[PDB]
LINE-1 retrotransposable element ORF2 protein (Homo sapiens), 1265 residues
Amino acid sequence: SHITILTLNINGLNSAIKRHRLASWIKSQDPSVCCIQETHLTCRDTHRLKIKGWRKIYQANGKQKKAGVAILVSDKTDFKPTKIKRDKEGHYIMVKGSIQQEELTILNIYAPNTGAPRFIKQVLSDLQRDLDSHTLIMGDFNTPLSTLDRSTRQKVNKDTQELNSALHQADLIDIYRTLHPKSTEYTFFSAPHHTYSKIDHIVGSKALLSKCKRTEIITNYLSDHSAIKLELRIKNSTTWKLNNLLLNDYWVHNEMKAEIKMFFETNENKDTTYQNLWDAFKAVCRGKFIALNAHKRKQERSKIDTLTSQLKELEKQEQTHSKASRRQEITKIRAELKEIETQKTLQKINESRSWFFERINKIDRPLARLIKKKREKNQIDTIKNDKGDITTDPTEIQTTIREYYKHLYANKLENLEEMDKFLDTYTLPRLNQEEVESLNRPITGSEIVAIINSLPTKKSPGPDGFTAEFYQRYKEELVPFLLKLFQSIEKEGILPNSFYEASIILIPKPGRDTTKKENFRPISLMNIDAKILNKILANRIQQHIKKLIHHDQVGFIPGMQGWFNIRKSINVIQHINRAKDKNHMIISIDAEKAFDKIQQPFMLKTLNKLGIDGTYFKIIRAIYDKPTANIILNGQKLEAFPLKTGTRQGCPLSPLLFNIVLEVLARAIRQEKEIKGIQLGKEEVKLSLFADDMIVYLENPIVSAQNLLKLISNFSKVSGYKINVQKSQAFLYTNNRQTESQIMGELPFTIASKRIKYLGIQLTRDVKDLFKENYKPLLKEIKEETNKWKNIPCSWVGRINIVKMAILPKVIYRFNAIPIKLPMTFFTELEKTTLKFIWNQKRARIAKSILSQKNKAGGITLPDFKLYYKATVTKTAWYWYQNRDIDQWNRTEPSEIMPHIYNYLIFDKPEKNKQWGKDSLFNKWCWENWLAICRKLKLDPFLTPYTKINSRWIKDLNVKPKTIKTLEENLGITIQDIGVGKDFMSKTPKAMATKDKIDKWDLIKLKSFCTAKETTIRVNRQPTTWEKIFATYSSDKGLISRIYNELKQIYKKKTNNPIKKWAKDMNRHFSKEDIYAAKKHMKKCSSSLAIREMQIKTTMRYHLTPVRMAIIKKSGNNRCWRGCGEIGTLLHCWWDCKLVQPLWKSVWRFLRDLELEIPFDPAIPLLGIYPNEYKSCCYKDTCTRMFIAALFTIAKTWNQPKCPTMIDWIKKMWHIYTMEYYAAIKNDEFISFVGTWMKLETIILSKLSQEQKTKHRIFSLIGGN
RNA sequence: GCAGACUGCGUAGGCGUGCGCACGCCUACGCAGUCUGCAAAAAAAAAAAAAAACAAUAUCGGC
DNA sequence: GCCGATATTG
Ligand SMILES: Cc1cn([C@H]2C[C@H](O)[C@@H](COP(=O)(O)OP(=O)(O)OP(=O)(O)O)O2)c(=O)[nH]c1=O
């Protein structure tokens, strides 16, 4: 073990290309510590020095752009800083700390070029107290220490002798001279003097020499000065993870195909089982990927390799003898190396910039991680230990964590008889024979390939490096081998030993003290193939889960939505409020460390008791046979500690198995008649909640809660399911204070007299406070959450997407959970804050009406929270119409009236004089909203094509229910299928059969009703989209989106369109076709949202012109902000301005140079409204980019007397060109890109001179140079 | 010259209250009218994907 | 419809 410390005088870091190339070179050297001098960064520019892959970066920056220092410590180096001193001018930075329990004192110094020894001595006197036997003084000393440090071999000056004396008194020595007494190497070459000299030195105490390993001066072309690289011995491999980018090269892809094929053609035979063969293939592919990555790195910089080899040989020749022609050749080849490295670094940085440009403002990773605060460092370094100690020692903290989790997962409680007794007491659903054989059906390549295709991307790999992009890429050839492996696994029931491998990582629990070990959630990364097998099993069991779990559970269950329970719970609480005798309670049980306290033997026993037997259960038992988990703590893979209990918390199959296991407890609670839950109408609602979270409602708590605790204790004893009774709240209701007190006594639960947080919702003790506890906070939160974004660096489009991404999901979730009649003040406040954020505390530049309108209007669909609220509220009508027996949440309401009538009211008569209850919280408001929408559509909502066969019309025909059952089971469910008029029972042979099968009285009743003229006309008319939205769809997926789109269409205000105003001030009527074309162009002018944002801003008259400012300020100066002396109308500023005209004239010179005779029409560039006769999109693709570049050019200098120069337009065009080039290469759209850019590149290259393009880095990309 | 706030006029729908009318609230709505952040923009931001998984749900968009 | 991305609950 050695510590590599590197020092370098980079002579400024302003050049980004030089920054990264030093950052790429420093990556190659892999130093343990790096000291950098003359960063040319200010305290304001500390943001600039942000390098990926390195976190602990300490900076000392001066005010001016002359100095500034920083120290980089390798992530492989565990330096624990204690005290830091920084120079206000960057000449020095002090840092005291320890490395691996070895104290280390590091000093960085940049002495002035003149009189450095005196300045250094002053630093020594100031830091005399800080020097110890572990001192490292670094930086730019600006002086040589010995005669051998100068090429001229000139005597060390008297200042050096005094400086050396000062170092000697401080027991500090020149390490390089000590370790290389006879080395005459030098770091900097002085061109004016033609002399080499070693003026940067590594100085430390002699005691460190025993630790010192090796020091060397590494001549480099990245800077005039060479770095000194010292290795320091300390008292004594990471996991390989495949890189997605590696798969993008064709050569490596073909090589991997060939390697896979040759392996499975060579290593296949009878003597080996397919599991061990698969593991061997994994290892071989791992080694092959490592080797081919090395080969790819070699080839990619092979030119650099040969050039640096030539430089090494010629530099050795120079050192042994220096020659003038050798000097000039060395200089030329060094320039060649610089140009090649600049080429590669520009490639890399522009590829990154293109990636950002393609996602600059979209709702995507860049925006999501811009909005989110800087990630809190999950790398733990000190935790309140078991007894009382905070602790910091890495090995002791690792031991604490590892032992904690090893003890957590090492418990099976082998008491199978007790598990049998518990399971054979609460009869629970069993899968029929058909479903059993469905689970055990053979694995099909179609199934595996479907899983692979659905396999999430951009996900961390498991203990093996393969990252689920590897399987997708080699899907076509791997899938057969995966199928063979799964066939072997199902036949034999033994998994490859690599399947059990998993990597636990400790993610902090939000809102919890990270210093406690117990507050970390261990999430598991599993081998992707193991995850494929587990996803297969999870999908298999999921095909039958609906009948396997009661609808009380809505966590991890397809098609069930969490808000169900919320509404249910709230209804229950409302009932409690309305009850005369309030003797009841609700408890929010929260499982402690669920998925980890689950006992695998009990889970397997439950699955066996469920009828899951055979191949599927064999594989389930195998996957839990010998699971293992390594804890990747601080990047170190700790020991294995096989987890004897719990279910892997990152496994696809774990949620389903946990739900199945806890369904046993749910069934037990429901069966127990002495745990009587609240009774609403004709339904019993004992308990319902997400997977591990449970909420129970109980009557007569004194006894029911005690019985519940007894049952939970039995379940915990039998299965390990433990509840943290302390962190498990409850509302208690009793009409006697003494009863409340004694219940508090017996019950071990903490009674929350105000509220309970529950699925992100503040359930309120009294429902009347719901809003005050749920929306008023949320609204306030949004305000706060947006106030910290006041200065967020995003454009109005970026802010709109930020709202849509961060606030909208939160607001919609709140609406879904609590669709109570919200006062309009809430929506006014929410819209006000949202808009104010979007326009950063200024007046909205674009009309809210324009943006709110659909994307057809060219905008970005500024979300309308009022319409989202209405959509969410009216959504419940879908469940009303469906009348599902599982949505018990809907039927739990005040029962003043016959509660059964809710599935009605949708496409059936209104029960005039019949009230739904003043106490109704959700359904009454949904009814009001649904009626409002139906009235707005001016449709009849009581008899429609989708009226169910039995809602009230047939019922009001006093039809026997058996007749309704016959009609339902024969033909369909809607009146339409029955038919009306001529078509009554006259459209299918089954219709005739039913017509014959009904009794004469009911038959004639249906004849009288259906064939009536009014019903015929009201049922036959084609159904509107709003009705298909609640009848045609049998699934509630995407329902809010569809309802909101329909509402958007319905409530589409007639706004003051700004394209029409462009027509007006251009005195030229635009045809509807012209408006449509302008909107289409604004929609698809470019993929990147910066280009589209520019086009949208120009089209929507975003830029406020001197006319606007004159009117608002009432000042008469309408003169354009350029000295043009004309009126400052928008068309002037964009098109008609003598200072803006030359740019458009140049653009038209380019157009004609492109053999394009297009009219000199402002509409074409400013809006894309091409003349009707001109429709050749081939040239439009280029013209759009040319025009938008011109628009950017004008906008940048939108108000300066400065003329938008041609060169600015060229530069912006090339910016777009490079971004699109790399984006297309990554997206494989290269042919279209060349088609739309080749001629333009040719003209641009011809127009410019070599000097100008070189200065602006305008080297061609499509064509070689 | 865009928009919201907001005064008033007023259409219609609903809910609650009172004895066809009156009151209170809300919705959607057009009109006239006062403002009102204001320099001017491009700041560059980096904003970084890349590590920390899993199930389900919702949203958005592009194809 | 798919196919990416984001948040919501665990
Ligand atoms: C929050 C979260 C939960 N889960 C799963 C694993 C958990 O066992 C299960 C329930 O989570 P929670 O109930 O939210 O957490 P918990 O009950 O395990 O924590 P505590 O013991 O302190 O109450 O959901 C994840 O897989 N990933 C996650 O990020």
The longest helix of chain A spans residues 324-358.
